[PDB]
Every structure is written in C-alpha cells, then in structure tokens.
Design a protein around this ligand. Sequence first.
Ligand SMILES: COc1c(C)cnc(Cn2cnc3c(Cl)nc(N)nc32)c1C
Length: 209
Amino acid sequence: VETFAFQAEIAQLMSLIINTFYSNKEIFLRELISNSSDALDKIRYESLTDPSKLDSGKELHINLIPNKQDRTLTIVDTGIGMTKADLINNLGTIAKSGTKAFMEALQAGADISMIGQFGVGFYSAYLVAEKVTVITKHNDDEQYAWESSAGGSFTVRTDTGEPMGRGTKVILHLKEDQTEYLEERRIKEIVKKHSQFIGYPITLFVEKE
Ligand SMILES: COc1c(C)cnc(Cn2cnc3c(Cl)nc(N)nc32)c1C
C-alpha cells in the first residue's frame, strides 16, 4: 500500500468541503453521476476509432448500490476508468487550477453547489462520506484501489478484489448522520431532480435488507 500527500491546494479544498456549514449536501450524487457520464462518453468516443477498447465490456451504464449493513453508497460505471498515473498525479494536477478558481468564486459569493463548474466535483463526496474508496480499471493498466479519509493523504494499492473489466466504483463510506442516502426514495428523488437527462442507463439497486 503506497501513501501519498495531497497537494496543499487539494487538502485545502477537502478541508473546506468537510468544515463549511452547507446544508444542501445532496449535490454530491449529481457530481459523481456527471463524472461517470463523462467517463462513459470518453470510452464510447475512443471505441469509434479503436473498437477493441470495448473488449473489456460493451455495456455503458451506471449503477447506484446502497448497502445498509456496510453503510455505503457505491456509484459504479463502465467508463474509461483511471490509470495509476491519473490516481497519483494527473487528476491532482488538473484539480489545482479548478480548486483555485472555485475558492476565488466562493470568496466572491458562489456556493458549494457550483463545484462541478470548476472540474473538482468529485471532492463533494466528502460532504457525506467519512471515507471514499475508489476501485478503478483502465484498459492496459491494472485494477487499483485508491482511498482517502482526507487528513492530507490518500493511499493507492493494486486491487485483488472482484475483477471489474473496465470502469470505476466510487464507494462512499457514509458519515453516521448521512444515512438518508441509503434510502431508495431519497436516491430516486435526487436523481430525478439533478440527473434526469444523463445519456446512459442508471440502475438504482434495492437493498436486500
Ligand atoms: C480517485 O478519485 C478521484 C479523484 C481523486 C479525482 N477525481 C475523480 C473523478 N474522476 C476522474 N476520472 C474519472 C473517471 Cl475515468 N471516472 C469517474 N467515474 N470519475 C473520475 C476521482 C474518482
């Protein structure tokens, strides 16, 4: 297991997200779904010029999986996935500029719900999650598990779990007071409100209870 420091700017963003009083936490789902939609668009586009990129799975979709036993909400997609380089360096690099702009915007009167406009919507996960575990598989790279409970560090390891074929699983380990996001009717409400025109099937799994 390798342990890495976030760049200071990203640590700062995560702190702001965790510490700021902001009631409209539900926007985290829309951001993650948007991210999944963008990853699906990317693999779809690449497949037009190299069809073998779908040898790791032709189906392009999103699954939302609540688990009350584990207190997790998992957002799964069969998008392009992330390389080791994405996890350790590239995403962080890109996020530095978006973070600065977002911070500036917040000082000028913007609110947290606008985070996606700055390309750093993933970190809104921390509105509701005490820990985020990301399982990902990109073509021509290995399956990785990234994890962070914030605090300035994250880990990356090669994943020995169920092989995914291609895609990303964002596993939200929900805060004790955020378990409404495990409830079917609440997830349906939020998807209808903020994610109604996504161009891929979104399947909301039901709890076995
Ligand atoms: C490791 O966790 C992330 C970090 C630290 C920053 N951004 C994203 C969003 N993100 C970036 N590329 C992504 C792809 Cl291909 N797919 C999805 N679903 N989300 C992505 C993720 C998941």
